[PDB]
Amino acid sequence: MKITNPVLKGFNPDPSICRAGEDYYMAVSTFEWFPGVQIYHSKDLIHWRLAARPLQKTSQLDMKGNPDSGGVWAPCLSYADGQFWLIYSDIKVVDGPFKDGHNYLVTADAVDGEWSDPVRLNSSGFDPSLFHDPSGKKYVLNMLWDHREKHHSFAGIALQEYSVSEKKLVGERKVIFKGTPIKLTQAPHLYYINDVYYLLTAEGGTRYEHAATIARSSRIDGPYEVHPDNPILTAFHAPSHPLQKCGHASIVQTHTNEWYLAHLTGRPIHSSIFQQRGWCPLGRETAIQKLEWKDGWPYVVGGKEGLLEVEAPAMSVKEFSPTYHIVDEFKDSSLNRHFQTLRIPFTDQIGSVTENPHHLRLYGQESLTSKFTQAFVARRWQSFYFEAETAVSFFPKNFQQAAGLVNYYNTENWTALQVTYDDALGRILELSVCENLAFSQPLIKKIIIPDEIPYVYLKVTVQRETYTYSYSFDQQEWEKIDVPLESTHLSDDFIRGGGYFTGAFVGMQCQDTSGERLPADFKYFRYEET
Amino acid sequence: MKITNPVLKGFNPDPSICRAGEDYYMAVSTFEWFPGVQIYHSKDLIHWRLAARPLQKTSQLDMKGNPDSGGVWAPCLSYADGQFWLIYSDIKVVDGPFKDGHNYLVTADAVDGEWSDPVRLNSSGFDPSLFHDPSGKKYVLNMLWDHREKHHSFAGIALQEYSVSEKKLVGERKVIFKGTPIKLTQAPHLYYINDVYYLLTAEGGTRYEHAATIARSSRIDGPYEVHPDNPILTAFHAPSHPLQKCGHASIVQTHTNEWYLAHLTGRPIHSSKESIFQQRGWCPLGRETAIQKLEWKDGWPYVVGGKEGLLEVEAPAMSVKEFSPTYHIVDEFKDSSLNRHFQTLRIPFTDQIGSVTENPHHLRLYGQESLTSKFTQAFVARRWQSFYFEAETAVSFFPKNFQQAAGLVNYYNTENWTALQVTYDDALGRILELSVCENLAFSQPLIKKIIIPDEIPYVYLKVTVQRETYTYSYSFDQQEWEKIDVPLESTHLSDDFIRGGGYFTGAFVGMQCQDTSGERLPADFKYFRYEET
Ligand SMILES: O[C@@H]1[C@@H](O)[C@H](O[C@@H]2CO[C@@H](O)[C@H](O)[C@H]2O)OC[C@H]1O
Ligand SMILES: O[C@@H]1[C@@H](O)[C@H](O[C@@H]2CO[C@@H](O)[C@H](O)[C@H]2O)OC[C@H]1O
Ligand SMILES: O[C@@H]1[C@@H](O)[C@H](O)OC[C@H]1O
């Protein structure tokens, strides 16, 4: 068969691919969304199933208060010595001269097993990677962040030995590579192939100038000579290409002795090589390319920009059963694996799937602008065309209580259709819009909800560059809210600030900024792509 | 003797004054600085001593990650039924349409005692106050925050009964007061005086339009009639007055049957190039606390000397009780507890960031995150409390990479600070570096790097603050001081200069170490001198 890119749809950046026998695994970054890291599994490189989200405890990942697009940046998943190794970061500062953030290591015998508590590695820069040297030694690579005024912040690739027995980095750290003229060198990954060390890096930054670079040396600490046709991957020069932002790659040699490269990519809604390259409401997604070797150097098959259709390896086609319900009626004892919360775990602080059977109950907490405790359960936008739908029982008694359907990028960028209370009108349906923290409520006439309506049905219809909300009081006749919203406003390319690394989500939310923790009961959640 | 204002100098805003027999207490807000809430004590209203900081545990106050000028906003301290009651806030969102934050109550039998773990009250707006009605019932008041687009955000004063037995608010909440045209109505305090309810509020916001408003009613839930000469306190109309931003007041009746009003105020530095009517000034010492005397006419209080406040106020008829200082001019860290004038940012002082016992007679700080981090900073600091002072320390620090730095810092928030630090250059060895962060614009303006010789065990660091400016100097033998020729502006560390929706603290000076490599490299500070004129 063939591989159709992207193989991971919607917000799934920074792919780290690894092999264990005939099983393939890919870890992707999750930023402020909890639980942390997503790990997918494949047996053919075509089809991938969401298999685990390892960082489930605050003892592993504590992100209350983390800035937007802080938290878990690029992870590294490897398999060696009969166990899985996961290297990850928790970034606490994403703007200004510093980038305060810590790198950790956890392990497990299976990706869906219990993962260990973390070992502190270092804090000296993001994109940490663990290299299992053929000698048996272990090394941690990461980019080096340089805060100093007269130095480029992307200071090169650092290497330091990791001692398994001491559970710490040991000895001296070395900068083994300063990068090519594209600069912004990061995402380091070492490979030892036919007695040669290959250093793979990302360069150019994760916007439309993104690229993958490779270099090689006979010693682990260099010096490294760069690929003669570098970069091996980039879509910068091809603004019409369906895959953009191609970079941050990792390499796997399959058990069939074939060579593939996983990388992140974005699929924009377009608007010219140097400006107006589009908007990516689905964020950064993951693609896989085939590699071909010539004279000890790898080349992406088909050219530097990547291909939508890639020759699949010589493996058995293996598709997995879907891992979410088109209509989740909340019959399971825990939330389906495609739902995430912001920053904190799903506990009785914010909600319950057992208090009211067959409902998700959310106790109203802080607003959508809060980096702390939000009663908000959401899942990724993973198509340009879908409807999402919910039914909510909510009886607010003051104007500080609201619950309903949300489409969300970060604390400053979201829209919400919520049942709330107005002292003069009673229970009402209100549309709130937050655009880089500029707040508007654009319905001139509020929508009035009769007291006798037990459930308010809420729907969002996403149709590429626009989406629109609708509602119903009986689920048969649907009223459309004639305010068309721009999908591009929920995109990496629109929002302000240093962190622009996630993607659009849709979910169920309740807020009560009066203090009463008033519950909202959601009967089902439908997510139906086209 | 007279009361000389401000009675609490430097960053000491939102004063809540209360009487316990013949002892007087005032609680002030502390925002992101930890431990939370400062309580001062007085026996004559002239002299005040720092008595306690009640919120010492993460179980009472957990602020890791809080925005700058979030955290503990205005507190309310009362004494009733033989115990102290402290209402406080933890604000989590300080920008945009929402102001997410929660209000809590804790109690204690003495202000320096062990305070209880908190009772949740509400989240509906800040400036919570607890009122002890003569009937024995209790009520919580606070401002009501309105996030809706078309509405003024200060939606009025809410009132709701508190049940001591159920440890929760009960019954209906009511808006009892909507304010005056000054708007931004906040800081509610109720008083029951001669069978009339007096509602005191702040209005106009805490910059130069700040004012104190008072209203009265026969019933606790109103409606309330406004003072005929409202506001009773403001300097809005008097740009040249030495006290500015006067508002957020509280009233005490002394045991001598005299009446006083505590309020916050700023003492701005002015520019000669600007009109004081257009550029009202810059306050590096933040919002401070003053006390005015009250007189009554026709059932309304008035501020003695006029609405603007006095610098020198007639003291009540009590015996003078002066206190000795509560900090050492030269602190040599011989004690195993940090002196009470030192605070940390957001988190408790533990082994995570430092120790005074690991290396005896030194403050040891383990390098952690940068000064721009809202999470874990190894930074111990105290308030600027004079326009003219010297602060000095001596640091033992042997950095091995450029991500390690330790030294003397002057600080307003994560985006506004300067630091003179021992650090490491790959081509020069140990150097002394000056870093400047100004609304997150970062510079290191020293042209020629200052090499530190390997044989120097301690580097001595000094800042001289002189109203509009301040300047760093250094020494390798503590005998001769060397100039760092970069003049710094004190007004850049002030409420009036920093950007963003939280502008509520004041400048601090202290000792800091960072290691953004991960090795938690320690810096040992031998002493900390803070010497005002
Ligand atoms: O670490 C991952 C990378 O893909 C990328 O890292 C860089 C962080 O700073 C940004 O300004 C750069 O453009 C970006 O390449 O994004 C963060 C994380 O996804
Ligand atoms: O709650 C205290 C008040 O003194 C004051 O409250 C208001 C907070 O929002 C600002 O925009 C207003 O100007 C201010 O008056 O400041 C915070 C805290 O000290
Ligand atoms: O009118 C008041 C309203 O504004 C508040 O939200 O809840 C209680 C009511 O008394």
Explain what the structure shows.
The structure is a homodimer. By secondary structure, the first copy, chain A, is an all-beta fold. Chain A folds into two domains: 323 residues, Glycosyl hydrolase domain, family 43 (Tachylectin-2, Chain A), CATH 2.115.10; 207 residues, Jelly Rolls. Chain A is globular, with a radius of gyration of 23 Å. The two termini of chain A are 23 Å apart. At the A-B interface, loops of A face loops of B. Beta-D-xylopyranose sits at the interface of chains A and B. Chain A: Belongs to the glycosyl hydrolase 43 family. Chain A: Its EC number is 3.2.1.37. Chain A: One of its GO terms (molecular function) is xylan 1,4-beta-xylosidase activity.
How many distinct folded domains of chain A? 2
Largest sheet of chain A, if any?
Answer: 9 strands, antiparallel
> What are the distinct ligands in this entry?
a molecule of 2 linked components (XYP-XYP), beta-D-xylopyranose
| CATH domain class name of the largest domain in chain A | Mainly Beta
Total beta strand runs of chain A: 41
Secondary-structure content class of chain A = mainly beta
Q: In CATH, what is the homologous superfamily of the largest domain in chain A?
A: Glycosyl hydrolase domain, family 43
Helix proportion range of chain A = under 10%
Subunit structure (chain A): Oligomer; homotetramer or homotrimer.
InterPro entries (chain A): ConA-like_dom_sf (IPR013320), GH43_C2 (IPR041542), Glyco_hydro_43 (IPR006710), Glyco_hydro_beta-prop_sf (IPR023296), Glycosyl_Hydrlase_43 (IPR051795)
Active site (chain A): 14 (proton acceptor), 186 (proton donor)
EC number (chain A): 3.2.1.37
